[PDB]
Symmetry: D3
Subunit: 152 residues, 6 copies
């Protein structure tokens, strides 16, 4: 289905290195629809809930602490199989294992500075979308190019 | 420098897939993104925003077109950023705009001029207050501040 | 080599403003533009070649590209027939989502290319010139 | 007024230097509609009639032989004020008088290798379109983004 | 033709990752890259480069900022490249530069204007000899010369 | 470790096809530091010692003579795993085997015209760097965004 959504966050290093526009354009150019966008500085408790599936692991306080270093750009992109295609566009979580042409493959090196966060799954996406955005922040509109992007 | 300006990508800018390129122009120039959101403001909100045009005849047409899709509201910060933003955006009429500005590269009709930008410092302050709660403004130091600015 | 392939930008590619970027990827790689035209083919010019209902919904850009292994490399530049299976960095990997809106078509073989080329172009449309950078592109 | 047309040609130097894609992109990105497109090699008599208003100028014989030195991308672009806007996108006839961000300001040096031709008026544009294209080559269609490009 | 100019990417331009893009603007225009290096000139080298500004009160601050990080020095060759090199860079004060120019695209403060360009054919001759040895100046025919020039 | 180094050279076809800018951009954008850069025209004996392990093999006198046909942009790039990541950025030695998004898969066709040289290992990089560059041409400075690029 074409209304599938996914959560993308530009991490503090993505913002600080000036990669907002480029990252947005990779999703814009692919035909996905921008459903929500905001520059925010989430609470530690917010970030702890975001990564709660990693709360047991040793790098957790450092991950959360890193992610407070400055504002994050939170986005929802909408389209058919966008979560999986989002993951493909971002590249592998480890940038050194990413293909050139992907975001991390073009712009990143270290797993701890991998510029972007993408949902692992439709399941996680709905979870992460709900955490970072109120329903009113999700924009309901039809893509002007819908019928040229999708056949069904 | 701490000067701020208000840039909105209009519904045509969003629907024509220009959010990324518009943001890039400002990032590349050295300006700092202080606030960003995709919103769908109310009719009254856009009438407040365009109050200086309440008496004119295109005001109802303008307000309704601004109602026709999501808008990207942004605050950019830097020295002389409100005058320099107006230069990056180009002349209000895209056919009077130079190539290499946003409207010079992307727009044709003044009623589809893809971006809104504040016309003065004072008006930028009013528009930032109108579109953003103060907690939506982000306070951080740009990683390259001393490479961008001498003072 | 003067091997040729046939690349078409489908009407979704044209209507989505992808003519420029698609041409640049073949240009930057070192292939030679041998033929180019915006056309709206017949429904019969297309059955020797929702699918056909939409192959008529807009103009098509028809192209011949000349260079060594251009038919196999052309498929590589275009990417997998289904965009959701194609890599970022390919045309469909950067720009498309659905197979039925996969932006462009290219020949599947060197002999299908010759046949597709003779079908879309008259021999006078095929240009014969020497790429200005030929000797820097090939040995 | 929304369907004014103009004639843009990529000269043989533009073609040989790999500027076909980038030139077509400036017009595309601005919102103009590609109405006709072809790679062709016009005869000498063609080029002399195309440049008929400068047959008396000293450069005319070199102009024509250069215009014969390789294939040309001929195009028709359609939109409001497209002939005048297209002149501005192209930039001054002499590239050294041309602002960066125009085609000639970004890509050319010599007035005699200025990469592009564009018509100098609406009426002149109609004459050139009729000269280089048959009616059947001009595509008629609505641009998928018409209502976001124009208010009419 | 074959007139030469001196262009330098200042430390801010190098440190903000603008070396690729600046080079592309000259490359795309048709000018020929005659010489190129990333270097760190001495205080004395930089004071001589800016000699005609010993008088002014910003001179010592200028010199030290030009020492704050490596510099990419270049020679570009082509017809009127000195003047055209100046149009490409834009007004020395970026806020006076037009979008489309390097300073109008990338820069804000005149003290952080990412690029130096010779103000003159004569001064370009000086600056080129100052920054490069003869062995570093490459002489070769641009592969596209006849398509770039009449 | 983040001060690893690799040797990358833009071959004469690369320089002559106007790829100096785009190539440097690929590495800049990834977050690697440019440590040395020079346009040079090496001697034949210099180039012979560069390929000394292919002195016998038949490629040599043709490979050497082609590497002499025009000037070369020598570079050193610095970063974590930069020698292996540089090879990934360049693409396969045969451009027809490299994926789009790499340098050779975007710009090249012939293996004897693959626009770019990159060392095959950390050790060969050290050797190749010492061969092409004088120690004082290696610049020692801290990347302005080192802490946003690396978690070290």
């Amino acid at each position: 289905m074409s209304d599938e959504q996914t959560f993308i966050a530009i991490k503090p290093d993505g913002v600080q290195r000036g990669l907002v526009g480029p990252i947005i354009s990779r999703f814009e150019n692919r035909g996905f629809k921008l459903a929500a966008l905001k520059l925010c500085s989430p609470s530690k408790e917010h970030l702890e809930q975001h990564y709660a599936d990693l709360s047991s692991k040793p790098f957790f306080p450092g991950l959360v602490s890193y992610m407070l270093s400055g504002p994050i750009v939170a986005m929802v992109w909408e389209g058919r199989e966008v979560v999986k295609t989002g993951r493909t566009i971002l590249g592998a979580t480890n940038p050194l294992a990413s293909a050139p042409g992907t975001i991390r493959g073009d712009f990143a090196i270290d797993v701890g500075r991998n510029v972007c966060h993408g949902s692992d799954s439709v399941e996680n996406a709905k979870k992460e979308i709900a955490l970072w955005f109120k329903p009113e922040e999700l924009q309901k509109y039809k893509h002007s190019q819908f019928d040229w992007i999708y056949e069904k």
